């Protein structure tokens, strides 16, 4: 599924991301835009043996288990394929875990580089 920004915003809001750990909804929508272009099926297979999965490009070393990544921690306790679902619940739940495990949103390189310090509210404006 490729979400619209407003539809994603509403779905993220239903799962409690607005203001989750002090990060406004627009931050999360902006992170998704630049990580995956709102595509739930996005994958980026890295040279280090890991792969980034789904709408938030969550990595298989620390966060989800794809079975094939060295050093797997599976801190989200999920198979990475769950992060490729049409519904975003598993991605959102793991994103919240990533923050809960001592990370800011700077854990997402696209967030740091493309959303941090910007007008993130543009991404929910008009929704
Ligand atoms: Cl959730
Ligand atoms: Cl929930
Ligand atoms: Cl693995
Ligand atoms: Pt939902
Ligand atoms: Pt929901
Ligand atoms: Pt939820
Ligand atoms: Pt739900």
Curated annotation (Swiss-Prot):
Name the job this protein performs. Lysozymes have primarily a bacteriolytic function; those in tissues and body fluids are associated with the monocyte-macrophage system and enhance the activity of immunoagents. Has bacteriolytic activity against M.luteus.
Q: Which UniProt keywords are listed? A: Allergen, Antimicrobial, Bacteriolytic enzyme, Disulfide bond, Glycosidase, Hydrolase, Secreted, Signal
Q: Which residues form the active site?
A: 35, 52
Name assigned to this protein: Lysozyme C
Q: Which reaction does it catalyse?
A: Hydrolysis of (1->4)-beta-linkages between N-acetylmuramic acid and N-acetyl-D-glucosamine residues in a peptidoglycan and between N-acetyl-D-glucosamine residues in chitodextrins
Q: What is a single molecular function from GO for this protein?
A: identical protein binding
Q: Which residues form the C-type lysozyme domain?
A: 1-127
Question: How is the quaternary structure described?
Answer: Monomer.
InterPro entries (alphabetical): Glyco_hydro_22 (IPR001916), Glyco_hydro_22_CS (IPR019799), Glyco_hydro_22_lys (IPR000974), Lysozyme-like_dom_sf (IPR023346)
**Which organism is this protein's natural source?**
Gallus gallus (Chicken)
- Gene Ontology process terms (BP): cell wall macromolecule catabolic process; defense response to bacterium; defense response to Gram-negative bacterium; defense response to Gram-positive bacterium; killing of cells of another organism
- The EC class name is hydrolase
What CDD domains does this protein map onto? LYZ_C (cd16897)
């Amino acid at each position: 599924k490729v979400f619209g920004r407003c539809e994603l915003a509403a779905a993220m809001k239903r799962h409690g991301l607005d203001n989750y750990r002090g990060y406004s909804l627009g931050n999360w929508v902006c992170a998704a835009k630049f990580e995956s272009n709102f595509n739930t099926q996005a994958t980026n297979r890295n040279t280090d043996g890991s792969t980034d999965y789904g709408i938030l490009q969550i990595n298989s070393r620390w966060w989800c288990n794809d079975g094939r990544t060295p050093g797997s921690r599976n801190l989200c306790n999920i198979p990475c394929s769950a992060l490729l679902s049409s519904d975003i619940t598993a991605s959102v739940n793991c994103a919240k875990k990533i923050v809960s495990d001592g990370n800011g949103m700077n854990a997402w390189v696209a967030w740091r580089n493309r959303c941090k310090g910007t007008d993130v509210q543009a991404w929910i404006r008009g929704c």
